[PDB]
Design a protein around this ligand. Structure first.
Ligand SMILES: Nc1nc2c(ncn2[C@@H]2O[C@@H]3COP(=O)(O)O[C@H]4[C@@H](O)[C@H](n5cnc6c(=O)[nH]c(N)nc65)O[C@@H]4COP(=O)(O)O[C@H]3[C@H]2O)c(=O)[nH]1
Ligand SMILES: Nc1nc2c(ncn2[C@@H]2O[C@@H]3COP(=O)(O)O[C@H]4[C@@H](O)[C@H](n5cnc6c(=O)[nH]c(N)nc65)O[C@@H]4COP(=O)(O)O[C@H]3[C@H]2O)c(=O)[nH]1
Ligand SMILES: Nc1nc2c(ncn2[C@@H]2O[C@@H]3COP(=O)(O)O[C@H]4[C@@H](O)[C@H](n5cnc6c(=O)[nH]c(N)nc65)O[C@@H]4COP(=O)(O)O[C@H]3[C@H]2O)c(=O)[nH]1
Ligand SMILES: Nc1nc2c(ncn2[C@@H]2O[C@@H]3COP(=O)(O)O[C@H]4[C@@H](O)[C@H](n5cnc6c(=O)[nH]c(N)nc65)O[C@@H]4COP(=O)(O)O[C@H]3[C@H]2O)c(=O)[nH]1
Lengths: 162, 162
């Protein structure tokens, strides 16, 4: 089996762990870097509370589709939680980290048409690197989760430092 | 999600398709070859009919574990059918084909001891190559399935020609 979240169509949490650990095993064999991004969408709770779960869902579908479109089909974009997304970028380079983040930040920031309204979410991104930040997905996700929370705290759209 | 067959512990048919199509997308991005092997184990029907499904199961567990230790953890070994196994070898080379097949053939051929009885299965392997034999997993599997059946029909324990 290999399940997808039906609303967003993105791989789910369980498939992300399985697929993710497979990408790290392959990158160890190939000598390639892997970056793990943790994306939190800020204005989400406000959407569902004001407009309802259905409006929040349309914000996710649209935001999910947009993000897929802007990263390689060979990369993994997963719905981790209710409004949390995890991204696995295979064969990534540290030099172009900042440039790839502005591509993903500009996508997530795009407003979404909901029942005539144009609603917007604000992203906060935590970045973890393989092999620098860990040996397995679990360790990279805890580090990317931690850094995503440092970014939200510094009111900066991303945090990637050791 | 991403399911495994509980008896053999190997990825199941559905996970093989999902993971397999992900490896082909990545190999298209990386310029690397992928070989798809289709392995049929003859003698299997004879084991279960003579000794029972429990003896047949022990022949699979053992044969699955043996194959799993003789290929890279980054490669996919899946239980396709009752006694059919599919193998996805990432970054494989046409020149080493014959040598790798003799490694897998020698493993599968090893007898399984269960209640003293020496129980042996005989493999027949069909080989398909990416990008020569197809664009997606489905096409490569139909070609390797076809060639596994041509190998069975012949003296040779493998068939890989166009
Ligand atoms: N700046 C930048 N953007 C990136 C990079 N990697 C992916 N993207 C973005 O992610 C989109 C989807 O990539 P894809 O599914 O790999 O699908 C790609 C891929 O299969 C192929 N392609 C384009 N350029 C290359 C390339 O330089 N190398 C390889 N291997 N394939 C490429 O054509 C498809 C369409 O590409 P786009 O329309 O441009 O759309 C791309 C592009 O917006 C990158 O390394 N740098
Ligand atoms: N996993 C992953 N890594 C990414 C992605 N985007 C950028 N990178 C990483 O950053 C490196 C350089 O990105 P760039 O400056 O956009 O420089 C890129 C860009 O100028 C171009 N390019 C490559 N792929 C595409 C593409 O699919 N679409 C477009 N439009 N341009 C591409 O070729 C250059 C070199 O490609 P690489 O050697 O692969 O080297 C890439 C890759 O290691 C991504 O969406 N996913
Ligand atoms: N002749 C041959 N046999 C192959 C080849 N690839 C895999 N194998 C076989 O598959 C077993 C498991 O490989 P692994 O999971 O990648 O796990 C490997 C891998 O993580 C590492 N390793 C060994 N040699 C290499 C290597 O040359 N390059 C890389 N990247 N890792 C290696 O040590 C682990 C255990 O390897 P072994 O005990 O040798 O056991 C190997 C070996 O019997 C190959 O290209 N040629
Ligand atoms: N997916 C996959 N492909 C395989 C496997 N076995 C061989 N190949 C492919 O065939 C090439 C040559 O294998 P080799 O002559 O045994 O020559 C190998 C072997 O002598 C050695 N080596 C590589 N991996 C291992 C290993 O895991 N264990 C041991 N003991 N030796 C290894 O390094 C040599 C060249 O390495 P590569 O560039 O990897 O080049 C490998 C690889 O492209 C496999 O189990 N899985």
């Amino acid at each position: 089996m290999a399940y997808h979240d039906p609303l967003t169509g993105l791989p789910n949490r369980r498939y992300f762990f399985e697929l993710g650990n497979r990408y790290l095993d392959l990158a160890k064999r190939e000598g390639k870097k892997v970056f793990v991004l943790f994306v939190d969408l800020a204005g989400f709770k406000a959407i569902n509370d004001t407009y309802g779960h259905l409006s929040g869902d349309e914000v996710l579908k649209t935001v999910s589709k947009r993000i897929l479109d802007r990263v390689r089909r060979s990369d993994v974009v997963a719905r981790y939680g209710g409004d949390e997304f995890t991204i696995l970028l295979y064969d990534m380079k540290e030099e172009y980290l900042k440039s790839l983040l502005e591509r993903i930040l500009s996508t997530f920031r795009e407003p979404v048409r909901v029942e005539n309204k144009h609603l917007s979410v604000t992203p906060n991104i935590g970045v973890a690197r393989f092999p620098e930040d860990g040996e397995n997905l679990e360790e990279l996700l805890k580090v990317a989760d931690m850094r995503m929370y440092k970014a939200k705290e510094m009111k900066v759209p991303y945090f990637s430092l050791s």
